[PDB]
Each structure stands twice: as structure tokens, then as C-alpha cells.
Amino acid sequence: HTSPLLAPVRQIHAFGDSYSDNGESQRLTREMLAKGIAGAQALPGEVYWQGRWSNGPTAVEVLARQLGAQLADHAVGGAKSGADNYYGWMSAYRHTGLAGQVDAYLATLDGKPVDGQALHFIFVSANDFFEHEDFAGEQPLEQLAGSSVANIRAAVQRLGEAGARRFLVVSSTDLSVVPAVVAGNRVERAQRYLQAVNASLPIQLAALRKTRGLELSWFDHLTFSRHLRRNPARYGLVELDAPCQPTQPSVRPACANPDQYYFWNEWHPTRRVHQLAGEAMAARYAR
């Protein structure tokens, strides 16, 4: 039996990575390129929609539309759960991980209080795994998951400390079906990492939610994706594995039917999947 819906949302503050970014990686990398920052690249690149790492709006953008909320989207493509980004060259200019996004949000309030009615949306951790795998990180995966969880819990604690009361935290996505992970033969490692984060994080958030009198919703993206991918025709999906828009090793022409694809590129879902995700995330809240 379902419980009562949560109260309406009129403002979202979103923190996260490429699964939420609505233009910040693009703005920031243009700034970095203008400044001559070593190793900078234009992100996300040419084969993307309006600076999103997809062919359309991210899930949190759809969530805000569903709930009738304004969105302040602080997410940066590549963001890790801690201070920095998958893109290490960014750290000389700005700390764009979740912790850095929280710092910049709290430092730009301009003498106003945190809005205790705003929903603080957190969606991060994938880059902790991708960085570890791509650059031979030292930690065993279980320790890496522990650090991801700690970092996320610390972000909620810091936002709560400053006055935030309402949160929606998204689980790890199903990294084990990401095309880049399949191509890297890293399915089992992704499974182990995502299971560890998803078992521990909601336990930690429920303790903090009770301690600090927060409203904190947990969104299980893994259950969500598993349901989509077991019953794709129900949702009008045909292709679950191939990217619509290949980019590795090089850019190739896009599929003609992107709304029938799960993945846009080798990491990121299509606008169609983002739409279903945002609708699913809106399900706990009254309009």
C-alpha cells in the first residue's frame, strides 16, 4: 500500500553529474578554454542537445516540469561525489564535484537564508566509478563505494546544517549496462560497486533524515531501469544496448529513431529515458 504523497515542490536545487547537467559543463568549459586552462576541452561536444549530455532535457528538468517547480541546476558533467571531477584539468579552475557544488551554492546565497521549502536533488556517484576504472584507482571497489556513500551523506548533512529541509537523493544507476562498461568488460565490477552504494546509502540517509528532521526521498534508479529494460515495448523502446549517437572510438552518424533507444552515447541515456525517469521521480510528490 502506497503512503501519502509528499507536499508540492516549487523550487529545485539540483546537484550532480552528466545525468542532471542542463548546461553547466558547457558554460564552464567555455570559460576554461577562454582562460587557456591546460587540457581543457569543449564539453559536452557537438553531438548533444543544447549543452546537455543527451539529445534532450535531463531527468531533473522533466521532474521540475512535472512538479511545477523552478530549477536551479548546479550539476556538472563529470562530477564526482567529492570535490572534483572525472576531468582532472578542471580542478585548477573550479571544484565541480558534489562537494564543490554544495560549497558554491552555500557561498552564493547573498545573505539570504536557504529556502527550507526547496527540494535539494542529489544525483551523483557514477564518475567515482568511471574515474577509478579509467585511471587505475587504488581503492578496492568496496572502499570506493564506501567513500561515495560518505560523500553523499556529508553533502546532505552540510546542506541540512545550512537550512535545507527537503531532499531527493537518486541511487546509483545501473552502471553494469552502460555501453562503455560493457565494452570495457567491466560488468561485474560495476555490479559490485553499484550494489554496495545502493545497499548502504539509503540506510545512512534514513538515519540522517530522522536525526535532523528532514524530508528525504530515495529514488531507486536501478529498480526503475530494470523495469524499463525487462518490458521495453511497453515504453516504446527497441534498442537497449547500442548508442544512438556513437562517439567512441569516433563520432558516427546518429540513429533515425532516438526515441526508441535507451542510450544516447556510450554513458548517457536518451531524452526518452530521461523523460520516463523524471516522471518516475515525480511520483512521490503532489503537483
Backbone as JSON, one array per atom type, in Angstrom:
{
  "sequence": "HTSPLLAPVRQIHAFGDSYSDNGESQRLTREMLAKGIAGAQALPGEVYWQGRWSNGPTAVEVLARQLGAQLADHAVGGAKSGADNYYGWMSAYRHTGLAGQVDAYLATLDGKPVDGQALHFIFVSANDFFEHEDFAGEQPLEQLAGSSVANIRAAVQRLGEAGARRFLVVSSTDLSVVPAVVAGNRVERAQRYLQAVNASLPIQLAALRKTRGLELSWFDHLTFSRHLRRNPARYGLVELDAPCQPTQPSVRPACANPDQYYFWNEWHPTRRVHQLAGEAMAARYAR",
  "N": [[0.87, -1.23, 0.0], [0.62, 2.18, -0.93], [2.09, 5.17, 0.51], [1.06, 8.47, 1.76], [1.31, 11.11, -0.69], [4.1, 13.34, -1.01], [4.49, 16.82, -0.04], [3.88, 19.54, -2.36], [6.3, 20.93, -4.69], [8.1, 23.8, -5.41], [10.52, 24.92, -6.01], [13.55, 23.61, -7.16], [16.82, 22.76, -6.26], [19.46, 21.4, -7.84], [22.04, 19.0, -7.76], [24.81, 17.25, -9.02], [25.8, 15.23, -11.81], [26.55, 14.41, -15.25], [24.14, 13.13, -15.67], [22.24, 14.93, -14.87], [23.07, 17.56, -15.52], [22.29, 20.72, -17.06], [23.57, 22.47, -18.69], [25.84, 23.48, -17.4], [28.45, 22.23, -17.61], [29.04, 22.93, -20.16], [29.02, 25.76, -20.09], [31.09, 26.25, -18.23], [33.33, 24.97, -19.36], [33.66, 26.45, -21.62], [34.45, 28.84, -20.42], [36.86, 28.01, -19.24], [38.32, 27.29, -21.5], [38.57, 29.82, -22.68], [40.2, 31.03, -20.85], [42.56, 29.68, -21.24], [43.12, 27.33, -19.86], [45.07, 24.57, -19.0], [44.68, 21.58, -20.78], [42.01, 21.71, -21.15], [38.83, 20.99, -22.7], [36.1, 21.41, -24.95], [33.03, 20.77, -23.68], [29.72, 19.43, -23.64], [30.25, 18.68, -26.24], [29.73, 18.41, -29.85], [27.63, 16.77, -30.69], [25.29, 16.85, -29.19], [22.37, 18.01, -27.42], [21.8, 21.27, -26.86], [23.79, 21.69, -24.88], [23.32, 19.73, -23.01], [24.2, 16.41, -21.85], [23.03, 14.54, -23.7], [20.26, 13.98, -25.92], [18.18, 15.64, -25.33], [16.29, 17.14, -22.67], [17.41, 16.56, -19.31], [16.6, 14.16, -16.65], [16.06, 15.58, -14.25], [15.21, 18.02, -15.14], [12.85, 17.31, -16.4], [11.47, 16.39, -14.15], [11.19, 18.79, -12.7], [9.46, 20.15, -14.43], [7.2, 18.44, -14.34], [6.4, 18.77, -11.66], [5.81, 21.38, -11.42], [7.79, 23.23, -10.71], [10.47, 25.63, -10.43], [13.84, 25.36, -11.57], [17.11, 25.32, -10.4], [20.0, 24.38, -11.57], [22.77, 22.9, -10.65], [24.43, 20.89, -11.33], [27.24, 19.31, -12.91], [28.67, 17.92, -15.71], [30.65, 15.01, -15.44], [31.11, 15.23, -12.72], [32.34, 14.17, -9.61], [31.53, 12.51, -6.4], [32.88, 13.74, -4.36], [35.04, 16.56, -4.1], [35.91, 17.11, -6.75], [36.25, 16.45, -10.32], [35.77, 13.93, -12.88], [37.2, 14.87, -15.06], [40.29, 15.92, -14.62], [41.7, 18.13, -15.11], [39.98, 20.28, -14.67], [40.16, 21.03, -11.96], [42.03, 23.02, -11.35], [40.72, 25.4, -11.98], [38.08, 25.19, -10.94], [36.3, 23.55, -8.4], [34.23, 21.06, -9.1], [32.9, 18.81, -8.31], [30.3, 17.11, -6.32], [30.71, 18.06, -3.68], [31.95, 20.46, -4.14], [30.03, 21.83, -5.62], [28.05, 22.04, -3.66], [29.43, 23.73, -1.84], [29.64, 26.05, -3.47], [27.0, 26.76, -3.88], [26.2, 27.33, -1.25], [27.85, 29.45, -0.7], [26.97, 31.48, -2.33], [24.6, 32.51, -1.52], [24.08, 35.13, -0.85], [23.51, 36.61, 1.53], [20.92, 35.68, 2.0], [18.63, 33.38, 3.56], [18.84, 29.76, 3.21], [16.27, 28.21, 1.3], [13.93, 26.59, 2.94], [11.75, 25.16, 1.89], [12.55, 24.41, -0.58], [13.43, 21.79, -2.86], [16.16, 19.79, -2.52], [18.01, 18.19, -4.71], [19.9, 15.4, -5.34], [22.16, 13.66, -7.33], [24.48, 11.62, -8.0], [27.59, 9.78, -8.34], [28.37, 8.0, -10.34], [30.73, 8.93, -11.72], [32.72, 8.49, -9.84], [33.2, 5.78, -10.02], [33.78, 5.57, -12.84], [36.09, 7.1, -13.03], [37.79, 5.66, -11.38], [38.01, 3.2, -12.71], [38.98, 4.01, -15.26], [41.44, 5.18, -14.79], [42.95, 3.55, -13.15], [42.44, 3.48, -10.24], [43.21, 3.08, -6.74], [41.83, 2.08, -4.55], [40.07, -0.75, -3.32], [36.92, -1.84, -4.75], [34.82, -1.94, -2.91], [35.66, -0.19, -0.92], [35.75, 2.13, -2.39], [33.03, 2.49, -2.92], [32.15, 2.84, -0.34], [33.33, 5.39, 0.14], [32.02, 6.99, -1.74], [29.38, 6.83, -0.68], [29.75, 8.05, 1.86], [30.53, 10.56, 1.04], [28.17, 11.55, -0.22], [26.36, 11.4, 1.92], [27.58, 13.32, 3.52], [27.23, 15.63, 2.01], [24.39, 15.96, 2.12], [24.25, 16.34, 4.87], [25.66, 18.75, 5.18], [24.21, 20.58, 3.6], [21.78, 20.37, 5.02], [22.67, 21.4, 7.53], [23.01, 24.06, 6.87], [20.38, 24.88, 6.52], [18.7, 23.48, 4.72], [15.87, 21.47, 4.15], [14.46, 19.61, 2.69], [14.87, 16.87, 0.54], [15.75, 14.98, -2.36], [17.29, 12.08, -3.12], [19.03, 10.37, -5.53], [19.68, 6.97, -6.38], [22.64, 4.98, -7.16], [22.76, 4.62, -10.71], [22.22, 1.91, -13.05], [25.09, 0.99, -13.69], [26.17, -1.27, -14.78], [25.12, -1.85, -17.29], [25.83, 0.16, -18.93], [26.99, 1.23, -22.08], [29.82, 1.8, -22.43], [30.87, 0.47, -20.21], [30.24, -2.23, -20.64], [31.71, -2.55, -23.04], [34.26, -2.18, -21.98], [34.58, -4.58, -20.63], [33.67, -4.73, -17.95], [31.46, -5.31, -16.49], [30.9, -6.96, -14.13], [32.36, -5.67, -12.17], [31.12, -3.2, -12.1], [28.57, -4.0, -11.29], [29.21, -4.9, -8.64], [30.1, -2.54, -7.4], [27.86, -0.8, -7.67], [25.95, -2.16, -6.29], [26.93, -2.08, -3.66], [26.96, 0.68, -3.07], [24.16, 1.15, -3.25], [23.01, -0.42, -1.38], [23.99, 0.58, 1.1], [23.74, 3.47, 1.06], [20.93, 4.32, 1.33], [20.37, 3.53, 3.83], [22.13, 5.01, 5.46], [21.1, 7.57, 4.77], [18.51, 7.43, 5.78], [18.97, 7.37, 8.55], [20.16, 9.89, 8.93], [18.08, 11.57, 8.06], [16.14, 11.15, 10.05], [17.5, 12.05, 12.32], [17.94, 14.82, 11.79], [15.47, 15.86, 11.16], [14.51, 15.86, 8.52], [12.9, 15.91, 5.28], [13.25, 13.33, 3.21], [13.55, 11.8, 0.27], [14.19, 8.78, -1.41], [15.25, 7.71, -4.53], [15.08, 4.88, -6.41], [16.9, 4.21, -8.89], [17.95, 2.01, -10.14], [15.97, -0.06, -9.79], [13.97, 1.16, -11.3], [15.26, 1.27, -13.93], [15.62, -1.43, -14.39], [13.0, -2.3, -14.66], [12.11, -0.92, -16.97], [13.87, -2.05, -18.87], [13.3, -4.71, -18.85], [10.74, -4.81, -19.98], [10.62, -3.5, -22.57], [9.01, -2.83, -24.82], [6.53, -1.93, -23.9], [7.16, 0.71, -23.23], [7.85, 1.77, -25.56], [10.46, 1.36, -26.38], [13.07, 0.05, -28.34], [15.89, -0.45, -28.81], [18.24, -1.39, -26.6], [20.94, -1.48, -25.99], [22.84, -0.48, -27.94], [24.45, 2.57, -28.63], [22.63, 5.43, -29.68], [24.01, 7.53, -30.8], [26.99, 7.17, -31.6], [30.24, 7.8, -30.19], [32.72, 6.89, -29.5], [35.23, 4.61, -30.71], [35.19, 6.93, -32.36], [33.11, 9.64, -33.58], [30.09, 8.92, -35.14], [27.37, 8.79, -37.54], [24.09, 9.57, -36.17], [21.45, 7.35, -35.06], [18.15, 7.09, -36.6], [15.84, 7.01, -35.11], [15.72, 7.95, -32.32], [14.04, 8.13, -30.07], [13.33, 5.5, -29.6], [15.49, 4.39, -28.42], [17.53, 3.43, -25.65], [20.13, 4.4, -24.84], [21.95, 7.32, -25.51], [24.69, 8.13, -26.03], [27.8, 6.43, -25.18], [27.57, 6.38, -22.45], [25.34, 7.8, -21.48], [21.83, 8.28, -21.11], [19.07, 8.56, -23.43], [16.86, 11.31, -24.33], [14.3, 10.26, -24.17], [14.46, 8.21, -22.15], [15.33, 9.79, -20.02], [12.99, 11.31, -19.77], [11.1, 9.33, -18.94], [12.34, 8.7, -16.53], [12.3, 11.16, -15.12], [9.54, 11.43, -14.87], [8.99, 9.17, -13.24], [10.43, 9.93, -10.99], [8.95, 12.04, -10.09], [6.77, 10.82, -8.95], [6.42, 10.48, -6.16], [5.49, 12.89, -5.21], [3.01, 15.47, -4.7], [1.45, 17.48, -7.22]],
  "CA": [[0.0, 0.0, 0.0], [1.41, 3.41, -1.05], [1.89, 6.17, 1.56], [0.62, 9.77, 1.22], [2.27, 11.84, -1.46], [4.77, 14.41, -0.33], [3.98, 18.1, -0.37], [4.32, 20.12, -3.61], [7.64, 21.5, -4.85], [8.11, 24.97, -6.26], [11.92, 25.22, -6.37], [14.55, 22.57, -7.03], [18.25, 22.94, -6.39], [19.96, 20.11, -8.28], [23.45, 18.73, -7.61], [25.04, 16.03, -9.73], [26.78, 14.92, -12.86], [26.01, 14.46, -16.62], [22.77, 12.66, -15.72], [21.39, 16.07, -14.5], [23.59, 18.87, -16.05], [21.48, 21.35, -18.08], [24.38, 23.47, -19.42], [26.98, 23.99, -16.65], [29.74, 21.79, -18.14], [29.27, 23.72, -21.38], [29.38, 27.14, -19.7], [32.31, 26.24, -17.52], [34.46, 24.6, -20.23], [33.93, 27.65, -22.5], [35.22, 29.75, -19.6], [38.16, 27.47, -19.07], [39.02, 27.43, -22.8], [38.86, 31.26, -22.87], [41.29, 31.37, -19.96], [43.76, 28.91, -21.59], [43.39, 26.33, -18.85], [45.71, 23.42, -19.59], [44.0, 20.31, -21.04], [40.56, 21.93, -21.32], [38.11, 20.57, -23.88], [34.72, 21.84, -25.03], [32.13, 19.69, -23.29], [29.86, 18.02, -23.94], [30.69, 18.47, -27.64], [28.83, 18.87, -30.91], [26.53, 15.84, -30.98], [24.44, 16.96, -27.97], [21.31, 18.95, -27.42], [21.8, 22.49, -26.04], [24.72, 21.56, -23.75], [23.05, 18.54, -22.15], [24.87, 15.2, -22.29], [21.91, 13.76, -24.18], [19.56, 14.6, -27.08], [17.11, 16.38, -24.81], [16.3, 17.51, -21.24], [17.69, 15.53, -18.3], [15.52, 13.72, -15.78], [15.65, 16.55, -13.24], [14.48, 19.04, -15.87], [11.48, 16.77, -16.56], [10.9, 16.38, -12.81], [10.76, 20.14, -12.37], [8.23, 20.44, -15.27], [6.11, 17.65, -13.8], [6.01, 19.21, -10.33], [5.56, 22.82, -11.49], [8.9, 23.85, -9.98], [11.61, 26.2, -10.98], [15.05, 24.58, -11.4], [18.44, 25.81, -10.37], [20.68, 23.08, -11.82], [24.18, 23.11, -10.36], [25.15, 19.7, -11.79], [28.3, 19.46, -13.86], [29.1, 16.7, -16.26], [31.92, 14.52, -14.93], [31.24, 15.48, -11.24], [32.41, 13.09, -8.57], [30.81, 12.74, -5.17], [33.68, 14.61, -3.53], [35.27, 17.93, -4.55], [36.4, 17.28, -8.1], [35.59, 15.93, -11.5], [36.44, 13.0, -13.75], [38.16, 15.72, -15.79], [41.14, 16.41, -13.58], [42.15, 19.5, -15.52], [39.1, 21.29, -14.18], [40.39, 21.35, -10.55], [42.79, 24.29, -11.28], [39.81, 26.48, -12.16], [36.9, 25.11, -10.1], [35.93, 22.24, -7.8], [32.92, 20.85, -9.67], [32.26, 17.65, -7.71], [29.16, 17.42, -5.48], [31.11, 18.89, -2.53], [32.27, 21.82, -4.69], [28.75, 22.41, -5.96], [27.44, 22.47, -2.39], [30.18, 24.92, -1.36], [29.37, 27.24, -4.27], [25.63, 27.11, -3.59], [26.09, 27.96, 0.1], [28.67, 30.7, -0.7], [26.36, 32.44, -3.22], [23.26, 32.84, -1.05], [23.99, 36.6, -0.85], [22.86, 36.99, 2.79], [19.6, 35.14, 2.19], [18.58, 32.02, 4.05], [18.41, 28.61, 2.39], [14.85, 28.03, 1.22], [13.51, 25.35, 3.58], [10.77, 24.51, 1.06], [13.15, 23.96, -1.87], [13.83, 20.39, -2.91], [17.57, 19.61, -2.83], [18.04, 16.98, -5.53], [21.28, 14.94, -5.44], [22.25, 12.54, -8.24], [25.93, 11.53, -8.24], [28.44, 8.67, -7.97], [28.91, 7.28, -11.5], [32.12, 9.29, -12.07], [33.64, 7.88, -8.9], [33.48, 4.51, -10.64], [34.42, 5.69, -14.14], [37.46, 7.57, -12.84], [38.55, 4.58, -10.79], [38.27, 2.22, -13.72], [39.76, 4.51, -16.38], [42.77, 5.67, -14.36], [43.54, 2.57, -12.2], [42.35, 3.84, -8.86], [43.88, 2.11, -5.83], [40.89, 1.56, -3.58], [39.16, -1.8, -3.69], [35.64, -1.22, -5.09], [34.0, -1.79, -1.75], [36.11, 1.04, -0.25], [35.35, 3.24, -3.27], [31.59, 2.66, -2.69], [32.07, 3.49, 0.99], [33.68, 6.79, 0.05], [30.88, 7.6, -2.43], [28.28, 6.97, 0.25], [30.16, 9.02, 2.83], [30.49, 11.89, 0.43], [26.82, 11.94, -0.45], [25.78, 11.7, 3.2], [28.17, 14.57, 4.02], [26.6, 16.7, 1.32], [23.11, 16.18, 2.71], [24.44, 16.9, 6.22], [26.13, 20.15, 5.06], [23.04, 21.32, 3.14], [20.89, 20.48, 6.18], [23.3, 22.27, 8.5], [22.8, 25.42, 6.44], [18.98, 25.19, 6.49], [17.9, 22.73, 3.8], [14.97, 20.53, 4.87], [13.83, 18.66, 1.77], [15.86, 16.24, -0.32], [15.53, 13.74, -3.16], [18.56, 11.52, -3.5], [18.98, 9.28, -6.5], [20.61, 5.88, -6.22], [23.42, 4.66, -8.36], [22.18, 3.98, -11.87], [22.73, 0.61, -13.42], [26.37, 1.14, -14.42], [26.56, -2.54, -15.41], [24.59, -1.93, -18.68], [26.34, 1.29, -19.69], [27.76, 0.62, -23.17], [31.23, 1.87, -22.18], [31.26, -0.5, -19.25], [30.17, -3.47, -21.39], [32.87, -2.57, -23.96], [35.45, -2.33, -21.14], [34.43, -5.87, -19.95], [33.7, -4.32, -16.54], [30.1, -5.52, -15.98], [30.85, -7.5, -12.8], [32.89, -4.64, -11.27], [30.04, -2.22, -11.94], [27.54, -4.65, -10.42], [29.65, -4.92, -7.25], [30.17, -1.21, -6.9], [26.56, -0.17, -7.56], [25.2, -2.85, -5.21], [27.41, -1.63, -2.41], [26.42, 2.0, -2.82], [22.68, 1.16, -3.16], [22.61, -1.09, -0.08], [24.42, 1.37, 2.22], [23.36, 4.87, 1.08], [19.62, 4.64, 1.83], [20.46, 3.29, 5.31], [22.75, 6.21, 6.03], [20.23, 8.75, 4.63], [17.37, 7.33, 6.7], [19.45, 7.78, 9.91], [20.32, 11.36, 8.96], [16.75, 12.15, 7.9], [15.49, 11.13, 11.36], [18.27, 12.9, 13.24], [17.88, 16.25, 11.5], [14.13, 16.27, 10.85], [14.45, 16.17, 7.08], [12.08, 15.13, 4.34], [14.28, 12.87, 2.28], [13.06, 10.75, -0.59], [15.2, 7.99, -2.07], [14.79, 7.22, -5.79], [15.84, 3.7, -6.85], [17.06, 4.26, -10.36], [18.22, 0.63, -10.57], [14.68, -0.73, -9.96], [13.4, 1.86, -12.45], [15.85, 0.84, -15.23], [15.38, -2.85, -14.59], [11.62, -2.44, -15.13], [12.12, -0.46, -18.34], [14.67, -2.91, -19.76], [12.62, -6.03, -18.94], [9.49, -4.63, -20.66], [10.89, -2.27, -23.33], [7.99, -2.42, -25.81], [5.58, -1.16, -23.1], [7.63, 2.08, -23.16], [8.2, 2.13, -26.89], [11.88, 1.21, -26.61], [13.52, -1.06, -29.15], [17.29, -0.75, -28.73], [18.65, -1.18, -25.2], [22.38, -1.6, -25.85], [23.64, 0.29, -28.87], [24.23, 4.0, -28.54], [22.03, 6.13, -30.84], [24.99, 8.5, -31.28], [28.34, 6.69, -31.24], [31.27, 8.81, -30.02], [33.98, 6.14, -29.19], [36.4, 5.48, -30.76], [34.91, 8.22, -33.01], [31.77, 10.09, -33.82], [29.45, 8.36, -36.32], [26.04, 9.35, -37.63], [23.05, 9.17, -35.19], [20.23, 6.63, -35.43], [16.99, 7.88, -37.08], [14.73, 6.75, -34.22], [16.31, 8.03, -30.99], [13.05, 7.86, -29.04], [13.23, 4.07, -29.37], [16.78, 3.97, -27.89], [17.86, 3.69, -24.27], [21.36, 5.17, -24.68], [22.28, 8.33, -26.49], [26.08, 7.82, -26.3], [28.25, 5.21, -24.51], [27.38, 6.54, -20.98], [24.23, 8.65, -21.09], [20.56, 7.93, -21.7], [18.36, 9.43, -24.34], [15.81, 12.16, -23.83], [13.15, 9.41, -23.84], [14.7, 7.59, -20.87], [15.31, 10.89, -19.07], [11.57, 11.65, -19.58], [10.49, 8.34, -18.09], [12.97, 8.82, -15.24], [11.74, 12.3, -14.44], [8.16, 11.12, -14.46], [9.06, 8.26, -12.13], [10.9, 10.63, -9.79], [7.85, 12.92, -9.67], [5.64, 10.01, -8.47], [6.27, 10.59, -4.74], [5.1, 14.27, -4.86], [1.81, 16.08, -5.25], [1.66, 18.63, -8.07]],
  "C": [[0.89, 1.25, 0.0], [1.13, 4.3, 0.18], [1.43, 7.49, 0.91], [1.7, 10.43, 0.36], [2.88, 12.95, -0.61], [4.22, 15.75, -0.81], [4.56, 18.61, -1.7], [5.71, 20.77, -3.52], [7.57, 22.65, -5.84], [9.49, 25.44, -6.68], [12.76, 23.97, -6.15], [15.93, 23.2, -7.11], [18.85, 21.56, -6.69], [21.49, 20.09, -8.25], [23.75, 17.38, -8.23], [26.01, 16.14, -10.88], [26.04, 15.11, -14.24], [24.58, 13.97, -16.68], [21.76, 13.77, -15.35], [21.79, 17.4, -15.18], [22.71, 19.43, -17.19], [22.25, 22.49, -18.75], [25.62, 23.89, -18.66], [28.31, 23.5, -17.2], [30.07, 22.64, -19.4], [29.71, 25.13, -21.01], [30.79, 27.16, -19.15], [33.48, 25.91, -18.44], [34.7, 25.74, -21.22], [34.74, 28.65, -21.7], [36.66, 29.28, -19.46], [38.96, 27.6, -20.38], [39.43, 28.89, -23.01], [40.07, 31.64, -22.02], [42.58, 30.63, -20.32], [44.12, 27.82, -20.59], [43.93, 25.06, -19.51], [44.78, 22.19, -19.6], [42.5, 20.5, -21.25], [40.07, 21.45, -22.68], [36.71, 21.16, -23.81], [33.85, 20.63, -24.7], [30.72, 20.24, -23.34], [30.39, 17.72, -25.35], [29.56, 18.78, -28.59], [27.54, 18.04, -31.03], [25.6, 15.7, -29.76], [23.43, 18.1, -28.15], [21.53, 20.04, -26.38], [22.63, 22.3, -24.76], [24.39, 20.41, -22.79], [23.82, 17.37, -22.72], [23.82, 14.15, -22.72], [21.35, 14.48, -25.41], [18.33, 15.4, -26.64], [17.29, 16.61, -23.31], [16.63, 16.3, -20.34], [16.51, 15.28, -17.37], [15.11, 14.83, -14.81], [14.9, 17.72, -13.89], [13.03, 18.59, -16.07], [10.76, 16.74, -15.22], [10.37, 17.78, -12.46], [9.49, 20.5, -13.15], [7.03, 19.69, -14.71], [5.55, 18.25, -12.51], [5.61, 20.69, -10.33], [6.53, 23.6, -10.62], [9.86, 24.57, -10.92], [12.86, 25.36, -10.65], [16.3, 25.43, -11.44], [19.37, 24.59, -10.43], [22.16, 23.27, -11.75], [25.05, 21.98, -10.88], [26.11, 20.0, -12.93], [28.67, 18.08, -14.39], [30.49, 16.32, -15.8], [32.05, 14.58, -13.39], [31.36, 14.17, -10.48], [31.67, 13.48, -7.31], [31.57, 13.66, -4.21], [33.84, 15.98, -4.19], [35.41, 18.09, -6.06], [35.7, 16.44, -9.1], [36.42, 14.81, -12.13], [37.53, 13.69, -14.58], [39.06, 16.4, -14.78], [41.6, 17.81, -13.83], [41.21, 20.6, -15.07], [39.49, 21.82, -12.8], [41.18, 22.66, -10.38], [41.88, 25.53, -11.37], [38.68, 26.39, -11.13], [36.74, 23.67, -9.63], [34.47, 21.96, -8.15], [32.29, 19.51, -9.24], [31.1, 18.1, -6.86], [29.58, 18.37, -4.33], [31.39, 20.34, -2.97], [31.01, 22.56, -5.1], [27.99, 22.86, -4.72], [28.14, 23.72, -1.83], [29.74, 26.14, -2.14], [27.94, 27.68, -4.08], [25.55, 27.85, -2.25], [26.83, 29.29, 0.12], [28.02, 31.76, -1.58], [24.94, 32.79, -2.77], [23.01, 34.36, -0.97], [23.11, 37.07, 0.34], [21.43, 36.48, 2.92], [19.67, 33.74, 2.83], [18.41, 31.0, 2.91], [16.89, 28.52, 2.43], [14.51, 26.65, 1.76], [12.42, 24.57, 2.89], [11.34, 24.03, -0.27], [13.53, 22.5, -1.75], [15.3, 20.38, -3.31], [17.79, 18.22, -3.4], [19.49, 16.6, -5.69], [21.35, 13.67, -6.27], [23.71, 12.41, -8.67], [26.48, 10.18, -7.8], [29.04, 7.99, -9.19], [30.37, 7.66, -11.79], [33.16, 8.8, -11.08], [34.11, 6.55, -9.48], [34.22, 4.69, -11.94], [35.85, 6.18, -13.95], [38.32, 6.44, -12.33], [38.95, 3.55, -11.86], [39.17, 2.76, -14.81], [41.16, 4.81, -16.03], [43.34, 4.81, -13.22], [43.6, 3.13, -10.77], [42.76, 2.71, -7.94], [42.85, 1.35, -4.99], [40.28, 0.26, -4.14], [37.77, -1.19, -3.95], [34.77, -1.02, -3.87], [34.39, -0.52, -0.96], [35.68, 2.27, -1.07], [33.85, 3.51, -3.01], [31.37, 3.33, -1.33], [32.36, 4.98, 0.94], [32.57, 7.58, -0.67], [29.73, 7.86, -1.46], [28.55, 8.06, 1.3], [30.05, 10.43, 2.24], [29.07, 12.41, 0.2], [26.17, 12.3, 0.91], [26.3, 13.04, 3.75], [27.57, 15.77, 3.3], [25.2, 17.01, 1.85], [23.25, 16.83, 4.1], [24.77, 18.39, 6.1], [24.99, 21.03, 4.58], [22.03, 21.46, 4.27], [21.4, 21.44, 7.26], [22.99, 23.73, 8.17], [21.33, 25.81, 6.37], [18.11, 24.36, 5.54], [17.09, 21.72, 4.59], [14.46, 19.4, 3.97], [14.86, 18.2, 0.73], [15.2, 15.17, -1.17], [16.91, 13.25, -3.58], [18.34, 10.32, -4.39], [20.08, 8.25, -6.24], [21.68, 5.89, -7.31], [22.5, 4.19, -9.46], [22.8, 2.59, -12.1], [23.98, 0.77, -14.34], [26.72, -0.12, -15.2], [26.06, -2.71, -16.83], [25.04, -0.75, -19.52], [27.21, 0.75, -20.83], [29.28, 0.69, -22.94], [31.71, 0.82, -21.19], [31.25, -1.93, -19.85], [31.41, -3.6, -22.29], [34.19, -2.7, -23.2], [35.53, -3.69, -20.43], [34.44, -5.69, -18.44], [32.29, -4.45, -15.9], [30.1, -5.98, -14.5], [31.32, -6.43, -11.78], [31.83, -3.56, -11.03], [28.95, -2.76, -11.05], [27.96, -4.57, -8.96], [29.63, -3.52, -6.63], [28.75, -0.66, -6.69], [25.74, -0.85, -6.46], [25.65, -2.36, -3.82], [26.91, -0.24, -2.09], [24.93, 1.93, -2.48], [22.2, 0.47, -1.88], [22.9, -0.13, 1.08], [23.85, 2.8, 2.23], [21.97, 5.1, 1.66], [19.51, 4.41, 3.36], [21.04, 4.51, 6.02], [21.79, 7.4, 5.92], [19.02, 8.66, 5.56], [17.76, 7.71, 8.13], [19.55, 9.31, 9.97], [18.97, 12.07, 8.87], [16.04, 12.22, 9.27], [16.21, 12.09, 12.31], [17.92, 14.38, 13.04], [16.49, 16.7, 11.07], [13.99, 16.7, 9.4], [13.33, 15.39, 6.4], [13.07, 14.62, 3.31], [13.74, 11.66, 1.56], [14.24, 10.08, -1.28], [14.62, 7.46, -3.38], [15.67, 6.08, -6.27], [15.85, 3.6, -8.33], [17.29, 2.86, -10.92], [16.91, -0.13, -10.74], [13.95, -0.17, -11.18], [13.94, 1.33, -13.8], [15.59, -0.64, -15.47], [13.96, -3.07, -15.12], [11.49, -2.02, -16.59], [12.72, -1.52, -19.27], [14.11, -4.34, -19.83], [11.37, -5.95, -19.81], [9.62, -3.48, -21.67], [9.73, -1.86, -24.24], [6.86, -1.62, -25.15], [5.88, 0.35, -23.14], [8.05, 2.59, -24.53], [9.69, 2.06, -27.2], [12.13, -0.06, -27.42], [14.99, -1.42, -28.86], [17.82, -0.37, -27.35], [20.16, -1.05, -24.99], [23.25, -0.72, -26.74], [23.4, 1.78, -28.62], [23.58, 4.53, -29.83], [23.13, 6.93, -31.57], [26.36, 8.01, -30.83], [29.32, 7.86, -31.16], [32.64, 8.18, -29.74], [34.08, 4.9, -30.08], [36.19, 6.82, -31.48], [33.41, 8.41, -33.25], [31.28, 9.51, -35.16], [28.03, 8.92, -36.38], [25.02, 8.74, -36.65], [21.97, 8.31, -35.83], [19.07, 7.57, -35.77], [15.83, 7.92, -36.08], [15.17, 6.83, -32.76], [15.31, 7.81, -29.85], [12.79, 6.38, -28.76], [14.54, 3.52, -28.8], [16.87, 4.31, -26.39], [19.02, 4.67, -24.14], [21.59, 6.12, -25.86], [23.74, 8.07, -26.93], [26.5, 6.6, -25.46], [28.07, 5.28, -22.99], [25.99, 7.03, -20.61], [22.95, 8.26, -21.81], [20.02, 9.0, -22.63], [17.34, 10.3, -23.63], [14.58, 11.34, -23.44], [13.28, 8.75, -22.45], [14.73, 8.66, -19.77], [13.86, 11.29, -18.77], [10.91, 10.61, -18.67], [11.02, 8.43, -16.66], [12.4, 10.0, -14.46], [10.31, 12.08, -14.03], [8.15, 10.22, -13.23], [9.49, 9.01, -10.86], [9.8, 11.55, -9.24], [6.77, 12.15, -8.92], [5.42, 10.11, -6.94], [5.62, 11.93, -4.31], [3.76, 14.68, -5.46], [2.2, 17.22, -6.16], [1.26, 19.93, -7.36]]
}
